[PDB]
Amino acid sequence: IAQVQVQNKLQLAMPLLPQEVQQQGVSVEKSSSSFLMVVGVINTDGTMTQEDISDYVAANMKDAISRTSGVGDVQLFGSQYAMRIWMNPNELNKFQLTPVDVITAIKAQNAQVAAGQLGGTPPVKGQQLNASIIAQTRLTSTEEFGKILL
Amino acid sequence: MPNFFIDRPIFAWVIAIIIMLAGGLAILKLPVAQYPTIAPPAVTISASYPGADAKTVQDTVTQVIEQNMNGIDNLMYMSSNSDSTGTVQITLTFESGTDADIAQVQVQNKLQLAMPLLPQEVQQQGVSVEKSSSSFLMVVGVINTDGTMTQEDISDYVAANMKDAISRTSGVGDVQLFGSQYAMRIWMNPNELNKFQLTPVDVITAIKAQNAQVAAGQLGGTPPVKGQQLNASIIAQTRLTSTEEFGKILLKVNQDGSRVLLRDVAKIELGGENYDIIAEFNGQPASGLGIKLATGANALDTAAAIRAELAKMEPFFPSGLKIVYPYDTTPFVKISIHEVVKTLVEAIILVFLVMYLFLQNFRATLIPTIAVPVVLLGTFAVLAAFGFSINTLTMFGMVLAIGLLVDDAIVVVENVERVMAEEGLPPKEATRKSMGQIQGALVGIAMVLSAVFVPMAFFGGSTGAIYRQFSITIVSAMALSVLVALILTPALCATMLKFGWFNRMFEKSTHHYTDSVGGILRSTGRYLVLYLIIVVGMAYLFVRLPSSFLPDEDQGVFMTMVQLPAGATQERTQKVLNEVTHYYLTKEKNNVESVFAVNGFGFAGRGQNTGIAFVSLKDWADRPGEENKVEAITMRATRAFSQIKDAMVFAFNLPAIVELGTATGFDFELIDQAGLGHEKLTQARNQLLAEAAKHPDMLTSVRPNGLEDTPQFKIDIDQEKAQALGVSINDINTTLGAAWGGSYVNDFIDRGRVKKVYVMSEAKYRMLPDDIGDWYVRAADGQMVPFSAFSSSRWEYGSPRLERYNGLPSMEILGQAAPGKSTGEAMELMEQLASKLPTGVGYDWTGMSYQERLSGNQAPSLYAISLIVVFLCLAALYESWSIPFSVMLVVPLGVIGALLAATFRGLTNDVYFQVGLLTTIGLSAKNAILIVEFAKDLMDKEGKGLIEATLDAVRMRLRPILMTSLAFILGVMPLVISTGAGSGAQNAVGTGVMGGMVTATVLAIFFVPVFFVVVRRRFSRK
Amino acid sequence: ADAKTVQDTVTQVIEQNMNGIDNLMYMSSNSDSTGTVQITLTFESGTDADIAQVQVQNKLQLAMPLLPQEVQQQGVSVEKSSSSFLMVVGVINTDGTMTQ
Amino acid sequence: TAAAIRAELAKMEPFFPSGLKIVYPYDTTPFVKISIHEVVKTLVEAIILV
Amino acid sequence: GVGYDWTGMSYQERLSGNQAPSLYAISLIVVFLCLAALYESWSIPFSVML
């Protein structure tokens, strides 16, 4: 209950938060103060980095140890990956572009967009043939993000 | 106690008046519903993304939400769907008795924080969490008689006048509309539109400012000026309220003195909210309304009250709003509970019909007639005390144990009126001595029957509770009898007692059988075996018999599932639904009442190429010959349909309990455990699938429950291109989007209700790829540009239904054990067949095959303990690590006969037969305790001995073991064994006991005394 | 508000949904004319308030998406509720160094 | 709760990459076990000492 | 087209009244039986409750 209440009065401030701080996601938990246990993840092959060993864990194991009943909190000892676009301010300056530009680009060029259907949801006269119209999908590599058009 | 109560019997009427009073009060305040709560609580989160595709829906929404279902208690697993209709369904199933009211909160609360990461367009339609309880009370259905009204019309009237009307009716816990509810359509036109240099975006951003609604103060109100005489509210802009009112919208003003209306560019017209489901009823436009119970409600009271509130409005119903009831549970529950109660009422007459025929008396028979409806029509109080509810399960729960609380009335008043009769005292003083002989062995059977029953409602989960009902009703009935048999009846027949053509014909037949009983005891080796060979026949018979849950029963309705191939169309689907429609009507009107036919939703998917047919039968009256029933009709349907070209049209009967599991197969999930793609998992699946068919030794039908990939129409927006022309990706996308996908602009008020406003091209200018051309978009310049200018178009494959298990891409596999092996072994194989699959692919078991896995088969483990609480209980009733062992070996004798309804009848190991097979052992062992008492009893009291006392026992004892065993095989063998009206269970209850209640007497009399002889003597060596 | 166009726009929806919650006894509501709604749900004497509160909040989750986006920006508050103040601790400044 | 955390990990180990190993740097469960299960040894051993 | 009901103090109050008959009855009935049990007779309690 307590949790239910906290979250319910929180919910009233939710629309008053900075768009950014919503985007991150607020969180409400009922956890013990202190760690029950810490689960370690190593690579013997030396084949992976810290960099990877985190991201693996996050993508591949965190999510469910989280949804596992009795786990009120999970701390990740690292970060899962993200598409990183380390801007360069001179480089940006030469071609006469701000970070705003970069952003607007990434936004519209890395999208996933419902373009409806061939079969029409309501149709005509009498028609066979019905298929999904598939517009843009989300870029999914360093390589693709790179090829953006500024 | 019984001695104390015989002397004060005036009180022992009070004790019984209450049991009654309270037993009655419960009856007159108990929940009645077909079944109780048996599925684990589930919570489905479901969302819409107007015109998406599995991929989009998945990575734009379903993923997001999953990545947030953490910190929620008692979750078993999470299942999720993303299909090409723009729809997501995520179902969190929760441990057994997790409170579902607080499991929904938790889910939903964790969702509200995710909401801001879903797309602004999903957030609009709104994601929503309900409690997954696919257990419909009934489904009404408003049809229009004359061809006046449409789907969307009927729909609108339904959710507008009657919807809330029902919603607020005494015991409806959920109402769910079966159609749209009028919505403001604005069916654009690329040409009417491209001519005025406008795109949809421009249409979009008008409905907005033209249809908004903005504030402005009062007058005084907020701080006024010194001394004011007037304060009243301003009313600025309102929202439009008509098709015509909408039609009139400024869309742009050109140098010409002329502008553009909204009407001019498109077709304004009120109409439906969503167009892919076609509710059609007996050919006619329908638009029903499904209704769920309420929880503590009454499937019969509210059943009525639906029909009441449905009247009142039938005056107000226009042209032809003739309401139909193509599915109601109410009848089935009534004329199954107006049975059952019938069986008791009757099995009562049977105990009065015997009794007389065995004891000339009237005041003898007229005591169990005032002892059974005490216990029985009063154990209801214990039920109602524990939250239980009058239902199929708990109802039979008694019928299955009526014989065990009869044999408690007969048994006492027997050895009272044939203890005085066998030369002795008056009435009071007889009951006093005669009770002192049974007094103990009732308290013995009490604890011994708490065992062999209680260790049930300790079982699995989904079928754990299925059992528990049985267990608790019985132990409650059983314990209440042992009480009235120690308080009321044994202080009643002491103040009530004292057919002719017969009587002496029994007194000859006792000695006639006591012939070989009195023999064969010089050395017992053939009788010691044969038993060892009954223990086998059974052990060979146990295994043979196939297992199952509650058997399919002829409920009012049944279903036909039409599935058109890959790219098919609702229209291509209707024509098939139209044959189904027809075959059923004119070709079966002596059994078929109606077909409620929905296309645009099926089983494996929610396609346009799918449909389902709810056919609801004639009343059970007009359905006489057994081939006028379900099992037959489906057979005659399923075949007659295996003739439509491309269109799998199967017909099938609803299962036992709708919202529970199913046929003892498996539910198997194939998971993706590295970044392996769809197009990689799909192979893995196909390997296994093929590798699974190769072993028909245990397979039947291994299959994907999903859908195979289909062709789809990619549109690749060239970026470079778009920039060089004055053309914006956002303008592009939206028009492609809104033309074809549709888009919810905002809301408006129509006839005092809020209703959506959708905007989307006519269907004329959105059917074929060759149709794209049509659509143009304004630019930097202000010039209309074709997609041809800035896009390529190519065909390709993409799943139209993507699936995930526990936030990890899944594909669900269904399959049975194949006529032959055990549910368990199939699973056992499948697992193996899965080990060889390409690295990074995993499996999990769900639903029915999750229950089986995490709930072993506690029968052996549990009944080990019961069978030990028995010896332990039983021993100390007597005084021996020995004597109880003579009672125990009575088990096999009832197992057989019951098991031997594998022979004479073609049935299975039901949950019913599983529990009748307990009420049998109850009598079996009880005899074994009475006979084995009467052998140790007068072998101590009169002081007799050896083979004399064992004969002395079965002597004064036999007749009861006859009166009752007869009473049962009568009261348990009516329509219970040989039926037609909610049969199934009836038959499974019956054959269970009946045959097997045979061998549990007419095989135990010649036997138990053997059991008291071979034991005792073997515990005295040299 | 616009009073009529606040009821029907918000209250008809919230009300549609409070359909069928354990021990509901009587619900009563009012629009306003400053744009204000108080739906109240009164549950059977004895019933558990905190659960009541939960279901009331569970059915709202369903109404919620179907209400003006400015009404959403606002709140829609679901909570247990009395009717009468237990007390009214007032507060005055002696020696006017503070106004109302 | 540890019981399961251990079974969720279990369930997902057959699919890690190259040489990716779980390791148990810290846990307050094992002590809490040994603890009661040696204080339960003090029951038996001290009855077999009466 | 114009109906009525009570709420608040009223609804409680009304529902106190409607109930009373049921109260006294089932209460008397309970006293009768309590005497039958106790004072051995099926109709001396019939005589106390006079």
Ligand SMILES: CC[C@H]1OC(=O)[C@H](C)[C@@H](O[C@H]2C[C@@](C)(OC)[C@@H](O)[C@H](C)O2)[C@H](C)[C@@H](O[C@@H]2O[C@H](C)C[C@H](N(C)C)[C@H]2O)[C@](C)(O)C[C@@H](C)C(=O)[C@H](C)[C@@H](O)[C@]1(C)O
């Ligand atoms: C041993 C090792 C752990 O230390 C503790 O357990 C001590 C004993 C807690 O106090 C213990 C004991 C106690 C009484 O706090 C003094 C109690 O209030 C808390 C909930 O648990 C501390 C300090 C808590 O902080 C307190 O959090 C409160 C919500 C408010 C308080 N504050 C800023 C005013 C603040 O100091 C809190 C949450 O555990 C700190 C967070 C950062 C942790 O999870 C860190 C990693 C801890 O697990 C720990 C360092 O590993």
